[PDB]
Design a protein around this ligand. Sequence first.
Ligand SMILES: Nc1ncnc2c1ncn2[C@@H]1O[C@H](COP(=O)(O)OP(=O)(O)NP(=O)(O)O)[C@@H](O)[C@H]1O
Ligand SMILES: Nc1ncnc2c1ncn2[C@@H]1O[C@H](COP(=O)(O)OP(=O)(O)NP(=O)(O)O)[C@@H](O)[C@H]1O
Lengths: 513, 513
Amino acid sequence: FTMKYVGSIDQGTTSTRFIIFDERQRPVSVHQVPHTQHTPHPGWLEHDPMEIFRSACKCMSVAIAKLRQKDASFRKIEAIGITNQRETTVAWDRVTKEPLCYAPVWNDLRTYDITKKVTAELGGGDSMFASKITGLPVSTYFAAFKMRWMLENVPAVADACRRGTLCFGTIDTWLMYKLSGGKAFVTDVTNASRTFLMDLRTRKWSPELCEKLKIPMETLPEIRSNSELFGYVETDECGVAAALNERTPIMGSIGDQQSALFGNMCFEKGEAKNTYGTGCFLLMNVGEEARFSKHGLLSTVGFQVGRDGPCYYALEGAIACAGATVEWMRRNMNLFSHITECEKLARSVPGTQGIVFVPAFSGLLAPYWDPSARGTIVGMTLKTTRAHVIRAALQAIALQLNDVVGSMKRDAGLNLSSLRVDGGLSKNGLLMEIQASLLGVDILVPSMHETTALGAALCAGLAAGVWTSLEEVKAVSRRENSWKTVSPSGSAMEREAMIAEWREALKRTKWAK
Amino acid sequence: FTMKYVGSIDQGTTSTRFIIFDERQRPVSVHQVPHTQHTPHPGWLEHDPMEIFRSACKCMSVAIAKLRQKDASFRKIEAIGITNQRETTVAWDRVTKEPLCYAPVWNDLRTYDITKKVTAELGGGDSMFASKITGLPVSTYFAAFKMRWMLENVPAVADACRRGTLCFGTIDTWLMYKLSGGKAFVTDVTNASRTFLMDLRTRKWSPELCEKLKIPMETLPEIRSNSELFGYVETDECGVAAALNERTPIMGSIGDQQSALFGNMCFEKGEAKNTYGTGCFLLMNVGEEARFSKHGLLSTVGFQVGRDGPCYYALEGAIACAGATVEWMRRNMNLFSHITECEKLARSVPGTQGIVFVPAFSGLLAPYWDPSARGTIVGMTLKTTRAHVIRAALQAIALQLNDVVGSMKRDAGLNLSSLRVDGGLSKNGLLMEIQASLLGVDILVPSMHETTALGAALCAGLAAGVWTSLEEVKAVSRRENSWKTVSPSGSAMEREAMIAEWREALKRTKWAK
Ligand SMILES: Nc1ncnc2c1ncn2[C@@H]1O[C@H](COP(=O)(O)OP(=O)(O)NP(=O)(O)O)[C@@H](O)[C@H]1O
Ligand SMILES: Nc1ncnc2c1ncn2[C@@H]1O[C@H](COP(=O)(O)OP(=O)(O)NP(=O)(O)O)[C@@H](O)[C@H]1O
């Protein structure tokens, strides 16, 4: 047969990419267009949904043009998969085919007041009142509370609700809508699981929660898997159907963190990914039975390949300041210049010789939520240097993950098998070594590090027959793309000390209000 | 009709210096020679006593040579005075007239074992057991514990003790011994008050503590005042007796901190000096009534002019040094390249806005005396920078200073009349304002930088009749030597709040064991 290609629209918080993968899972064309960060009031953050749709359309047609200018075997795209910034919610009109306002973004805080009242009035004071249904606490992040807000603050949304023309959708839904020309109103299980309106046991909308949160079920889209036929591209927005040439099905849709889980081949229970970005998002595949957290971690859907196919659940945790902490050492403190120095300076001392740097600049998250904790350094001597503090910052990041994984292992009732990693801070080799040493497991670093875009492409290519099974997807990956594997190295003495010191230091972190 | 000159050997921790003053209290010739800082184990510090005695003679001979280039009618020096690093203890045989071993320095920690036997075998847990007699807690600093250490551990020392020839002496005693050529074996009240073998009140040796610590009294020298004939300079070490021309009396001797007190005209009760150096120290004159301390501070002789004229008394607090902390920020952490920036960045922000930095790199000294405290920063956010940390580091020195002064008020039963502050950091103007505001007093900065050396020269001058009274001394000073002065410019709102941050930050510093 001939060369096969699968496309991935990667719609992030600050930009959109399109990446074309070949049948070997190589990224062979890519383009990136940013979209505007609108902030009307402090704490508020909005995206223009038409700009987002247009950006993806541009990325598609540029990346396609560049591919066919440099690859004479590239005939067409077999299917498109989509991955997205989760929780971000769009409100649009079923007849104008267009938004009634900008989209409040995942980390937007305008829903704070609604969050206090849902916990008080429906929760009886308990923000975990629906956690056995949603997998989620009452939080500003989740989609329903942004839907709620738009009805209470945007006349045109509240209007359109009345007339029976209102569509609420996460970015997966909105994109597949405008890509379709309005023919598809779908969402995948992983995105659906971030709304506070889905039931994890059924993977279906919860009539109760919709009712108690006063969100009409007609406004919501239909829940499907991550990998199956969602529709077709049928739009000439930036000559995207001209670029695609032939009729191209949308056969993949997955929320970004879940997409990184899937693109890192975390298919068996006990496999986990961490994205070392500005913050950290760790997801572990906990197997086919959902698992709930006694430590405030989120339960969510990992993935689901095929309509009503096996559905693997996951647990999810975050640290807020990973790459941010590295950046803070460079800009705010002058501890180094080019980002390659961070690791070189940290390597130049064999340990931290007593100091702990807890970088809780915007609170502690993980399994010890404490928004009063601030950034704090303890134990410094006249022998302490920037080298020591940099290494300690890296130790910190690895220690939080270790605490985060500890919670997951007890909640899930299983062990960590290995940790696949990506992001950017995963290029820091010494961090990766400290992380493996603390965890006692091998850390796998894929060299093709476009894993978030890849997850979406695998879903699409699976559904389209490009790859025929999860075991073939792993084989193609091992055969074609390299994986640097980082084994634990240190000692039980060093590890216990570091964790003991960590535990003490956390007791000194409280400071705010 | 023809100008009289007075010499001053300033024998410091890292170097020895000779300053010749004239009748105007102006330094007219100076010369410096450093000596070796021996560190044979971690925590230990010792000095070669002959290297010190030689440094001193070299300083005298060069200083004299230069002075007679400037004033070719300079026949002779009226008298010499001595000021020295206190507690540093030398052991020497009285017939070889040479040291039995190197001299353990004030801040040497080798006596930590012997110091603990004393706090249990006599102190019964309470270190402060001889407090009413000596002024001082049981600490590793004081001469007795080092005289003991050398007897228990250095063959030739305990040899010469059994042979009836072992002299002990502080650096004053050692300098006056060797300047005499063996003829004089004396010490002054201020140095004596650091031995842990003298009654603060009476200023004579205590046979109780001598017998209880098993230092024979034969080994100790004759206590005298700070201002009287002690001896003559008879040695030839670097032609020093030739260079003096006439025979030259040693008429002055005073420990360095007291010499800084006496050289900044702190004659009235309530007057106080802050000295920046190897160690950093605040001393306050508390009048002729000897005052004792609950709050950890030391009680010591301030000064005593003449064969029992009035003896003044003082309280003493060790700070953390501004210099070390500033230098640590500079060359350990890279927060600024040159010292001009340290102040600019500190000024560049309005306040610390949340953060505290307790620069207790080897323990809280001051009134809290906690050896478990380490260097701590609390309350950081992403909006925190080198500037805020540098300002916080400066606040913390003022706050340590305040707690010491607040402590001095409760124990003396008086207040800070005014504060004098020359040293490594009086070229930092922002620290001075912050200091003056928290303490609510005037900060006198003398522009003659040789004020510690001036102290011993004033004593020697009073005895030899270059000056007649403290009035003349004061009068010449205000006439010849200027001082810039820095006023308070804060309030209780900023003060009492800035202390509240501080007092709460102190609680999270604990970190040893
Ligand atoms: N080669 C490198 N070595 C070590 N650290 C790096 C390197 N490159 C980047 N970093 C740091 O790691 C972070 C990686 O960020 P990156 O993931 O590329 O972008 P981002 O904006 O954080 N996207 P996200 O992962 O979605 O949060 C940066 O914030 C840097 O501080
Ligand atoms: N105003 C003065 N009256 C008498 N002698 C002086 C005076 N000023 C300087 N001398 C003498 O001049 C010689 C050189 O001293 P030197 O310090 O170099 O003078 P200067 O350059 O004016 N500095 P200063 O001592 O601060 O006045 C010494 O012998 C001083 O005693």
